[PDB]
Amino acid sequence: AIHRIRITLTSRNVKSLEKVCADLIRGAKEKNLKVKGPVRMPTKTLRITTRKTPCGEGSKTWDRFQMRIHKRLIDLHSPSEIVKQITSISIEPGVEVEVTIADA
Amino acid sequence: QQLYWSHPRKFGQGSRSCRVCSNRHGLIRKYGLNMCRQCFRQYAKDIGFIKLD
Amino acid sequence: PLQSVQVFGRKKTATAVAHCKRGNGLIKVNGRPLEMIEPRTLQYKLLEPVLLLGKERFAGVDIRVRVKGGGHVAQIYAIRQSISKALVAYYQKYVDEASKKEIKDILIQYDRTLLVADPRRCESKKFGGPGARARYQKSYR
Amino acid sequence: VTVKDVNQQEFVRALAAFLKKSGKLKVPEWVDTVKLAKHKELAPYDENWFYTRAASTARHLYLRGGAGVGSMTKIYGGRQRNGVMPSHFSRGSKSVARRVLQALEGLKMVEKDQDWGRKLTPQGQRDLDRIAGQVAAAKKK
Amino acid sequence: MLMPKKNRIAIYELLFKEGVMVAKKDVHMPKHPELADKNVPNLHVMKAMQSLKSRGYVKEQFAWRHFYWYLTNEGIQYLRDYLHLPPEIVPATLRRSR
RNA sequence: AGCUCUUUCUCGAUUCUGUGGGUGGUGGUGCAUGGCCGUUCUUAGUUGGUGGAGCGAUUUGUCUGGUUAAUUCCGAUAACGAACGAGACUCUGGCAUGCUAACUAGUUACGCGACCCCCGAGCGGUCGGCGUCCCCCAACUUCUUAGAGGGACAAGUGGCGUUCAGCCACCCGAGAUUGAGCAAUAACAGGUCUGUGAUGCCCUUAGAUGUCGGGGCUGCACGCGCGCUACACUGACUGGCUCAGCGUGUGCCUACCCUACGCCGGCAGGCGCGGGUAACCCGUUGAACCCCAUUCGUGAUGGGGAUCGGGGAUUGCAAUUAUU
């Protein structure tokens, strides 16, 4: 068989994310289902703004923290082993991964 | 049993706190974090909120 | 299909893309003639390139432009830049270099940035004023 | 002229009048009383105005895939003077625009569009294009 | 702290079998998810546990308004007695490993 | 409120009663304390090694001069060679018809017919024409996107200056300085016990200083600070041109989302739907200034919208002391 498969990956520090994606992409085609290679999605900037005190009298000073979510997907078509294989290596830090069957 | 002992807690300041510290004041409710600002300052590193600019 | 280039123009917020392809020749913006445009006072600003370089030229070419972004003046500057850059991009692949240089000359001379994008862009406001350089108010005591 | 060809003010001005002559549009009996927007200071000076809005809307729809009253309320909606507070948007009435949308249907200028929102009909598309030409034709000036 | 002679057994008996307990620091939810043959929330459970701890028998950790309850050795004997149960007892450790 | 009482059932050894002992506190002290934080300070400040100079603590280095945003550099100098803050460093944003790519992003351009209008031309078939829709075994990455790439080094040149460090003009071109974040040595009776299950001691602790019903915090001759809105014809008005961007959402630590579209209502709003864990949907955020065809006409008037009266509705169990 062949099954149309979508892998989404969402996570943070870049250079790791980028080379997880690299790897899914390169082994994907390399034994060529041929992807639909990493679609980089606009990275999401969570912003929090607070006064630096806990608690106030003082030049009003402000701090803003971010948390930057990065998303990608990659489109595979196959089956059995190369599915659960290609997902599961490609594993470790900091990396959410979801795989979706097809259509709806 | 004591029908006596509660009045609505559904909404307002009184309906929420700090998952960290009980405080019903200065509460960060964005992104569902629900931490008071004083605490959030101390835990923003372990949550994944880092200073960049 | 035919000889054709694409170009763009950029002021403030509001980019303007030009597709400049061989045609009868008569110069439309988003979907209406370059004769409507209005803001209007400005309207010459967008005529400006054509006059600078002789109304003819555009007779071997069809011109269309789309602007999204910026605001009303912002847009005008972008579209005009896109059009002049367009015409020059076109003489560079199809006509000859001396002609295009002649055109960059007339524009660049009198100018308005027509072929070069103005840098100037928002500076971020900093806590303690509602502007970037504006600082709130103080009373001392 | 496509309607796109004619300037918005003259187009609307001509069509609105044409509607007036036709004599069959239909008109919430009110229209004498109504402001047209809570934001509004006074009603419309031209008590005759129902026609102008209709023309404006017909033209507004023809341009775009499909539109509905909320959008119109906002379009008509101007800035409202909070008084002590700073001014803010306030999308303009919904009865007038709705009635306008319902009435236009009667003429067939517009029809319910798929997935919500009213769209121009080919009957209307034809009608607007026709007046558009008449306006273009009138004169130069 | 206070309470029933039945609820107390529910608490002690579950504690003896689980060897651990958790309760969010709320006195209102009255009921707690998991176990709870329902009757209580921190209170009866918190108070009973708090009393159990003061006499030893259990060590309590607060952090994050949950209070995590850990049964102690001396305590195992004590609940052994309350339950009266079969010597070798054998609560929420038994185990394998590696 | 079975709180208290009358009446007499009920639970069943938990509790009660006594002793000793805890426990909470938005109780007090920041002038008893951690942390965090303001301030000196983003100022140019700070120090060691090794030597020289002194019995010694110490001193020179770390300076007359020039130069610099900066103890930044040059030079001179009994010092030489370094580190700390500054800087470099990191982040954000512009210049890349280059890079590698994209149906959860678009564009070209078909195939494009259709809707299809006639808008002009044609008598019409047919041609040129702006959009929507078709979606395709079309093509693309230009706009869009996010990753990697390069660009600025005051680079060249010319004046000036110890002819140095630098300064100024000029070219390519994004021009030397886009804008933040990061902050030393050492201090303060700066602020914080009401952020802290951080915390001492103290105080209190059943007739509580630990919760519900109700009010204050919102009581008005007067002063102050931050602001908002104004004083009009660059305007106030009515019709009409008309473009955006940072960001945001439900399916949630315990009750609940963003809302396009039909209808009713002058409004306020009411009501029926249907999509959307979202680059898909709300939202080509069709914003507002503004631009404009009118009116007003220099009258506190149409500038201004205070105060008050009546009334409609929304949130909530509850709005009276107006939530709005």
XYZ file of C-alpha atoms (C1' of nucleotides) in Angstrom, chain B residues 3-11 15-16 19-21 23 25 30-31 34 36 38-39 41-43 51-53, chain F residues 1 3 26 35-37 90-92 179-182 195-196 211-213 247-249 253-256 316-318:
56
model
C -26.138 24.885 52.950
C -24.583 27.782 54.639
C -20.975 28.500 53.545
C -20.985 29.670 49.856
C -21.919 32.454 47.449
C -21.097 32.499 43.731
C -17.449 31.993 42.717
C -17.941 31.685 38.971
C -16.338 34.894 37.803
C -13.082 33.153 40.969
C -9.323 32.565 40.385
C -1.643 28.087 40.625
C 1.624 28.848 42.333
C 0.594 31.038 45.319
C -2.849 35.470 45.311
C -3.971 40.017 42.606
C -2.977 35.108 29.018
C -2.169 31.819 27.257
C -2.634 31.725 35.368
C 0.519 36.008 39.462
C 5.370 38.248 41.011
C 5.547 34.487 40.634
C 8.773 36.606 37.189
C 10.411 33.873 39.242
C 9.189 30.974 37.079
C 14.456 37.604 27.523
C 15.442 38.680 24.038
C 14.672 42.393 23.714
C -28.615 29.878 60.841
C -27.660 29.872 65.485
C -4.175 40.917 53.711
C 14.812 37.340 46.899
C 13.092 40.691 43.554
C 13.377 45.897 42.488
C 22.350 39.249 21.400
C 17.498 40.756 19.538
C 14.335 43.415 16.177
C 15.948 50.871 17.441
C 16.184 47.990 21.658
C 18.020 43.915 25.158
C 22.557 42.359 28.162
C 3.992 38.029 45.598
C 6.165 34.393 48.488
C -15.985 32.844 56.892
C -21.343 34.263 55.038
C -25.783 38.832 55.155
C -1.778 41.159 17.942
C -6.419 37.529 19.455
C -9.661 32.986 19.765
C -7.665 23.374 37.101
C -13.543 23.119 36.527
C -17.154 27.348 33.752
C -17.003 28.683 28.873
C -24.719 39.230 36.823
C -28.594 35.624 41.593
C -28.123 40.515 43.155
